[PDB]
Amino acid sequence: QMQLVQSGTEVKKPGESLKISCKGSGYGFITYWIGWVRQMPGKGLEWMGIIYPGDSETRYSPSFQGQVTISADKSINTAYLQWSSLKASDTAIYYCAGGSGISTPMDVWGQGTTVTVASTKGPSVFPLAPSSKTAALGCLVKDYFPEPVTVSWNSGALTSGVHTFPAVLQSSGLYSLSSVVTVPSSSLGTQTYICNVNHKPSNTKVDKKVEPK
Amino acid sequence: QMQLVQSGTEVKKPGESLKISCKGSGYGFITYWIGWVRQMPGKGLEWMGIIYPGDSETRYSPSFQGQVTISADKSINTAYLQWSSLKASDTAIYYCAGGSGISTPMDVWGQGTTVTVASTKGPSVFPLAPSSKTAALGCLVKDYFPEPVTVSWNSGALTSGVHTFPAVLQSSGLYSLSSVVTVPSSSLGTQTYICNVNHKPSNTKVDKKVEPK
Amino acid sequence: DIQLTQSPDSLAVSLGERATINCKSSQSVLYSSINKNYLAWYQQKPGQPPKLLIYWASTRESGVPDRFSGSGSGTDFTLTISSLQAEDVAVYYCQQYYSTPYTFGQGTKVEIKRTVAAPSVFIFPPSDEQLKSGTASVVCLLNNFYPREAKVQWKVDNSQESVTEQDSKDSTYSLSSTLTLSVYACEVTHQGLSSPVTKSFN
Amino acid sequence: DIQLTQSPDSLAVSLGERATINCKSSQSVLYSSINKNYLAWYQQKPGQPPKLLIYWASTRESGVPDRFSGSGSGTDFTLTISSLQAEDVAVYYCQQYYSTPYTFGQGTKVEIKRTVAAPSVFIFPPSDEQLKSGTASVVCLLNNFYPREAKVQWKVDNSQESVTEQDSKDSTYSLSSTLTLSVYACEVTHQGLSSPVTKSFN
Amino acid sequence: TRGVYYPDKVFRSSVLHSTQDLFLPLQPRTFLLKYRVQPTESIVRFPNITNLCPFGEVFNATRFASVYAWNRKRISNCVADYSVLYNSASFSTFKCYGVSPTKLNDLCFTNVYADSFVIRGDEVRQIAPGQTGKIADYNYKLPDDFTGCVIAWNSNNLDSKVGGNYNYLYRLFRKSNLKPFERDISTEIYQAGSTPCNGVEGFNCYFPLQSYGFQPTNGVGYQPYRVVVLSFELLHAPATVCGPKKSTNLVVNFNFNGDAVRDP
Amino acid sequence: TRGVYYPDKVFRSSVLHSTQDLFLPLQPRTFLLKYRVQPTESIVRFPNITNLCPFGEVFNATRFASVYAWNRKRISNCVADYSVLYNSASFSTFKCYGVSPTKLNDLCFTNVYADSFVIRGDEVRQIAPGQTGKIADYNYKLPDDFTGCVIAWNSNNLDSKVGGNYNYLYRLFRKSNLKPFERDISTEIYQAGSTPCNGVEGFNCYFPLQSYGFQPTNGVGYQPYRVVVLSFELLHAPATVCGPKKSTNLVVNFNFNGDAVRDP
Ligand SMILES: *[C@@H]1O[C@H](CO)[C@@H](O[C@@H]2O[C@H](CO)[C@@H](O)[C@H](O)[C@H]2NC(C)=O)[C@H](O)[C@H]1NC(C)=O
Ligand SMILES: *[C@@H]1O[C@H](CO)[C@@H](O[C@@H]2O[C@H](CO)[C@@H](O)[C@H](O)[C@H]2NC(C)=O)[C@H](O)[C@H]1NC(C)=O
């Protein structure tokens, strides 16, 4: 069983040209028909194309026929998926999977590489106050594009009862996200709360205290 | 000025695959756009295609678009014209000619290679008798396919007044041809006449005497 | 060219109970020469590539535990988990590999089931910072509630809803309803809770 | 996409006389940037590849003798041979090389001219061999006749005609008319010959 | 009724599970657990690990036949090991439509036919299900549904005489296409026109067979590729080809070569 | 009226031919043959065979500009020799639309402009009349009718720092296409949506310029190709560029640099 190692994660602006490599390592790699599959966020898989390394016979899908180009290089055992001009709807995760013949289920799957196409906007973090009269407290990240934002509580010291909610895109486009912890009313006075918001595309690392009002 | 040397003469049966090479020899061959031209028997030239050696940009003609394939090999400075399945109408002479740029007249012309597609049928040579009452005599080649038939008189000794007439195709397809010499009535008695008909495709070499009846 | 269908979409069963998933094909995918159905079943866990589970719709790949069984014929195929365990919550895909292109299934999400719970409600008003920007946002927090059959209504004298995934240790959800606006109350209706609850802040 | 036209097709002039050939294009082939007409004139001799003669329709390639001149503008172009010689009998092609594809001219055949001649007629019947096969063939031979304005009629109580190319040393033709059939006479009408001639064999 | 333990560890609830384990009536027996002679032994017998298939006499041979009359061979009653897939020698192609060679070993097949011929470099593609060319119309035609493995490799040194190996021929002109796996070896004179020429090879009458031009100083496209096409079929009596698997003694549960059976 | 010989040898008949030869009124004069001061000398003067065009300062330079703001140079009053066409150094391409470089030498041109820039390996094709791409829409646009010569070569060693030569940039987002040979060097913030973001490069507002990633351990397709585009024009006063030709003395027939003219 020969494993497949993928090239890596690329972030690109609209209008560029993008080449993704699938590398095949292992013995017996004389008959593996490489195929590509794309998973959009939180959706089902959609098969794209299949190429035989070497001979280079290439079969496509009707939806994707001609949008992208699948090519193979036999000497180093690689498969390339190329976009001539990627749009802003191509943000998704791509998996290269290798079958052993035509009409054979795909059994060896590469890790997969995400693609993000967008313009970075940093996160405005605002802390909610715990109601004066257990009780809950948390800080509310807003207007951050694109996903993801990492919210770590007290440099990772606190982990019990920490609810992190998936980002929901409202009209402006910029997703919002709220993370809330539950604390008994005994530790409210003494224990200090610092949420750490990391947005790497905008390179914004903020440490914001949660204050009881 | 770099000269072009053509590959040579090929005779093929219908249904085959045919590759013709144009070889370019000489200094300065960094910008010569090779082009191909076909001359059907006794007709005007008809331009077919033009390819740049290297980059391999290929421009075709509407009539021939997709019938043939023009490719170039840069390392050895060659151009290839290929037929996937040549028919019986492709018998003609082909010239490769090299321009110095786009929108430039073609000045260096290769010798050219004829192509013949047909089934060989040998020649029936029959000698006409000179009328009893100068006078003319000659032997009449019939039912020979395809062209050409070489008629040599007395192993080339006699050359004055030897009329050779171009072959005319009658209904059967097999062209006929008559060669006639004019001899004064003094040498009729003594000089012997032997016409030598050579049809190389059928490998038929015949020596037939002309007899006064 | 031969679209598939799966059912049911989301199924909840208790630990140790059976689980049946049905895949339906447009046309029979039986190869005449070998008389073998061409259809496979895949398992995907959140955040990882899928894994082969059943090929030819009757044979198991090496290492797969006996619990997973595959049956069916003609166009109708099913995957049966004789007894579900704590590791099988996942999404299952049925794929036909007869002729290109290879269509995939919609995907079935298998989750476990617990007894009804009642959600302790919370309410957070906007801070001083939210006010300055010009877009106040109030939020109401349901916590530790099973099942997801509920509904939050805001009360004043434009909203979104973020539901979290099942908590692994104990299968309880947590719903956050948020109101964005340029007596403020949250009222929650849930099946287990007999009387809709009210949280108001003056 | 821009077809050309030439005229005249066949022209006969004497040695040392002028020769004018006209090429007409569908649309003007003038390049705005350099203001140069894009059109070339080619010479082809029987049995050899063509040779460039004039490019840009006004300039001569190296080694071409002065005799050959090219003129014209707009769509109308002409090639003038001030004095023809014994080496210029050939076929001339006008080609436009403005935009692909490159169309070619029909081709003009230039041949010399001599004074009228009278053809000594011949007649050959079929041999004994022709009879056995089943297709007798009789032939009549015109020789050394200028010009090619003539006509052979067979007389009995299905034909072909083979005319040879101009004899190089003296410009005289030779026509062979042949009759294929499963008092046999050949009668020839030619302009120079006052009375149609008759050759019959009993 | 004492000593019923927990056979497995999979947590079950309210599902009656029939199990075949060792219990106290320790002895093997089957039980029903609430949340007739029982086979006392299980034996398996596959062919001895010797007597391999003659893959050598198909792959490593002195001369392969021409494509117009290919060579067909039937190998059976062997333990085929499929070590050929590794490129131990030169192996340009390995397609294997319909069946995975990797997992092929574990299965027991019937009479895998091998077809061997020599073809030109370009036309190797035409050996596929659903191809349209001179090879796949008049010489060798593959069924639409194919469950086999196409193997092609290059041997320029054995098939390229400096004069030219003209002993390899193929059929060019035929009346109609070939039904799957039909070998039509004939030397008639093709009547391409309404000329009854009675085998004289004259005008409008050709000869169907025509040689191959092979030269060492020639391009890759026009080179001699030797080909072997493995075809696996399975109908009945699968006691023939069976991938290598160890066996036990003979004395019950039985597994013979995957009412009367002959011990291999 | 004595001594009229046969000037030429071309056989003529009944064609009056005006000829300029030496006859007896020996002296040069013009005659009409039946089948005013005459220019006594012919002189030609072309620029001295020195002072060549600085082809070096265009081809062999330390740094070429980026494609968004290419470098334009005007060379004039030189004897250009066109020995560049020989691949004395590496020369991947040589197209020369509209004019033959071989026969170009004999002609006298006006101010052949040279344009120099650096582009990526794939996009070299886009430098042609009638191309549609990011280069030939927002960076450098060629007129439909082109009478010049595109020269591109590869220099991996000068433009590939192991860290990466990121100092080469190109324009990505523009409002409208470029009129032929227009250089728009600007650093505004492209408004891609109805967000008046006042140069903050926020959501829906990008930056048009974006660097090139160049690495030595990279594919041929993504490599740095240096390009130079020769553009020949001819309007009036052709006394500038003129291919090497010898000259004679000055004293008549005259040929000056191909009512008042300045001797070069
Ligand atoms: C044809 O001959 C070659 C050359 O001997 C065989 O290649 C050998 O195969 C054995 C099988 O295990 C290996 O141990 C050797 O190392 C191989 N030799 C090499 C790689 O040089 C080949 O196997 C033969 N054909 C068949 C079908 O067995
Ligand atoms: C750029 O530099 C190279 C290297 O010197 C030049 O190549 C030389 O050109 C001269 C011109 O006659 C030749 O005599 C040399 O033999 C060449 N050197 C070689 C081939 O190694 C090149 O000409 C220079 N660029 C220009 C425009 O002149």
Residue numbers in the entry:
A (entry chain I), B (entry chain H): 1 to 133, 139 to 218
C (entry chain M), D (entry chain L): 1 to 157, 164 to 188, 197 to 216
E (entry chain B), F (entry chain A): 33 to 57, 270 to 279, 319 to 534, 539 to 545, 574 to 579
Quote the paper:
The spike (S) membrane glycoproteins of severe acute respiratory syndrome coronavirus 2 (SARS-CoV-2), like those of other coronaviruses, are responsible for receptor binding and membrane fusion at the beginning of virus replication. They are also the antigens recognised by antibodies that neutralise virus infectivity.
The single-particle reconstructions generated a map with a global resolution of 3.7 Å resolution and enabled the description of all the domains of S1 and the unbiased building of the Fab and RBD. The high resolution of the data is partly accounted for by the formation, over time, of an adventitious but stable dimer of two CR3022/S1 complexes. The structure of the S1 domain, to which the Fab is bound, has undergone significant rearrangements. The RBD has rotated by about 30 degrees, the adjacent intermediate domain by somewhat less and the entire protein has extended to accommodate the Fab. The overall interaction area between the Fab and RBD is 930 Å2, of which 590 and 340 Å2 are contributed by the interaction between the CDRs of the heavy and light chains respectively. A second, smaller interface occurs between the VL chain of the Fab with the NTD and accounts for an additional 270 Å2 of interaction surface. The most substantive component of the interface between CR3022 and the RBD involves the heavy chain of the Fab interacting with one short loop of the RBD (residues 368:370) and a second longer loop (residues 374:386). The interface of these two loops presents a strongly hydrophobic interaction to the Fab flanked by electrostatic interactions.
